[PDB]
Amino acid sequence: DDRTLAENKERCLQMVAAWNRWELDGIIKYWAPDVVHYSEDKVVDTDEMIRRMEGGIQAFPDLHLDVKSIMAEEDRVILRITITATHKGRFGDLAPTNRKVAWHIVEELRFVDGKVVEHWDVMNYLPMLKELGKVPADV
Amino acid sequence: DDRTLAENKERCLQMVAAWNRWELDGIIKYWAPDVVHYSEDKVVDTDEMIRRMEGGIQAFPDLHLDVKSIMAEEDRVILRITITATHKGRFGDLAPTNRKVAWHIVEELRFVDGKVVEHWDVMNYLPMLKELGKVPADV
C-alpha cells in the first residue's frame, strides 16, 4: 500500500518530467490502451486529448509544469500544478505574442498495475486567455 | 494516521453540507483564526475570501456542491467538486438571466488539530462564463 502510493507518485513525476522535456511519448506510454479521459464531467476521446496536448506544446514550446502539491490514496494520485510558458507558437489562429503566461491545473489519475486507466482534469486557463487578449480582462 | 485522514475528510464533507444549506458559519467554524487562503498562487485576505463567498451566493442563491472525489494524505484533504446553480442574482457586469450554469473547482485543505490552517483552490468557471455569454463560445 505505502509501496503502491510511492510508486504511483513516481509514475506521475516521470509523466511531469516528460511534459517538461516536451515528449508526449513519455506521458502516453503510462496510459492503458482503453484509458478514459474526463474534462468538465464529460469523456474526452483519446485522439482529441493527444491533439490538445500537441496543440499546447506548439503554442507554448517552453512550457514547464511546477508541481505545487502531490497526494496519493488507494489507486489514485492528485497533482496541483502551475504551468509557466512564453507564447512563441500559433495558438489557434493567434500569431505568437511572445508574452509570458501562467495557468493552474489539477490532474487526478487512477492506476491499475502501473497503467493510467482513468484521468480527470480541472484546468483554470483564464489567466492565460486574459494575457493573450482572448477574453476581457475583468471576467 | 488512518484515523486523522477519516476525521479530516468528514470535516470537509460537513463544510460542503454548510455551503449546500448556504450557511457560511458552518464552513468558517472549521477555519483556524490565522488560516491562509491561496488562489492562483496569490494570498487572499481571509475577510476578502468571505466577501467573495457571499458574492457567489447572491449571484447564485440555489448553488449546489456535488463532490466527485475526495482524497486524504498526512494532514491534507483534496475535493474535486462540480457546482451547479441558476443565475438569479446580478453577476458582475451582468443582470439575472435565470440560466442554469455549472463550473468546476478543486479545493486542497491542510488541517492542524481539526482546524483549516491553509486552503488552495483551482477554479474553472470558463463553462459558466460561456453560458452567460461573457466570453466567446469557442474560447
Whichever domain contains A103, its CATH number is 3.10.450.50
Three-state SS at A105: strand
Nearest chain B residue to A79 by CA: give it. B78
The secondary structure of chain B, three-state, reads CHHHHHHHHHHHHHHHHHHHCCCCHHHHCCEEEEEEEEECCEEECHHHHHHHHHHHHHHCCCCEEEEEEEEEECCEEEEEEEEEEECCCCECCECCCCCEEEEEEEEEEEEECCEEEEEEEEEECHHHHHHCCCCCCCC
Confirm if A123 and B127 have CB atoms less than 8 A apart: no
Confirm if A38 and A16 have CB atoms less than 8 A apart: no
Confirm if A12 and A97 have CB atoms less than 8 A apart: no
How far is it, in rounded angstroms, from Cα A113 to Cα A100?
Answer: 39
Q: What is the dihedral of CA A114, A115, A120, A126, to 10 degrees?
A: 90
Which among B55, B59, B71, B57 is positioned nearest to B106, based on CA atoms? B71
For B90, the grid coordinates are 446580478
* Chain B interface with A: residues with Cβ < 8 Å: 5, 40-41, 68-69, 71-73, 76, 78, 80, 82, 92-93, 102, 104-106, 108, 120, 122-127, 129, 134-136, 139
Contacts (Cβ under 8 Å, ≥6 apart) of A31: A46, A115, A116, A119
For B110, the grid coordinates are 491542510
How far is it, in rounded angstroms, from Cα A87 to Cα A117?
Answer: 32
Asked, for residue A50, whether it belongs to a domain, the answer is yes
Measure in Å the smallest separation between the Cα of B107 and chain A Cα atoms. 10
Nearest chain A residue to B41 by CA: give it. A82
**What experimental approach yielded this model?**
X-ray
Asked, for residue A21, whether it belongs to a domain, the answer is yes
For A136, the grid coordinates are 476581457
Contacts (Cβ under 8 Å, ≥6 apart) of B80: A78, A106, A108, A120, A122, B67, B68, B69, B70, B104, B106
Confirm if B56 and B63 have CB atoms less than 8 A apart: yes
For B79, the grid coordinates are 475535493
Total tally of structural domains belonging to chain B:
1
How far is it, in rounded angstroms, from Cα B96 to Cα B90?
Answer: 5
Asked, for residue B97, whether it belongs to a domain, the answer is yes
Structural domain containing residue A36: 2-131
For A87, the grid coordinates are 507564447
- For A66, other C-beta atoms within 10 Å of its C-beta total 13
Among candidates A102, A122, A134 on the partner chain, residue whose Cβ is nearest the Cβ of B106: A122
Measure in Å the smallest separation between the Cα of B21 and chain A Cα atoms. 24
Confirm if B111 and B75 have CB atoms less than 8 A apart: yes
Which amino acid would we find at residue B54? E
Start-to-end CA distance of chain A, whole Å, equals: 44
Asked, for residue A61, whether it belongs to a domain, the answer is yes
Confirm if A10 and A36 have CB atoms less than 8 A apart: no
DSSP string, A30-48: TEEEEEEEEETTEEE-HHH
Asked, for residue B136, whether it belongs to a domain, the answer is no
How far is it, in rounded angstroms, from Cα B123 to Cα B120?
Answer: 10
Nearest chain B residue to A137 by CA: give it. B135
Asked, for residue B138, whether it belongs to a domain, the answer is no
For A52, which DSSP code? H
- Sheet bearing A76-86, strands edge to edge: A42-44, A31-39, A115-124, A100-112, A76-86, A64-73
Length of chain B: 139
How far is it, in rounded angstroms, from Cα A55 to Cα A26?
Answer: 17
Asked, for residue B139, whether it belongs to a domain, the answer is no
How far is it, in rounded angstroms, from Cα A117 to Cα A31?
Answer: 7
Asked, for residue A136, whether it belongs to a domain, the answer is no
